[PDB]
Amino acid sequence: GPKGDFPDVGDGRILAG
């Protein structure tokens, strides 16, 4: 995810369904 707390592909993700 981009703008989030879960680093994925930027800053972080919000959903991970």
Side-chain angles (χ1 to χ4, degrees):
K3 232 167 210 225
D5 265 335
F6 292 61
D8 40 309
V9 191
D11 218 340
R13 206 170 47 199
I14 58 179
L15 178 65

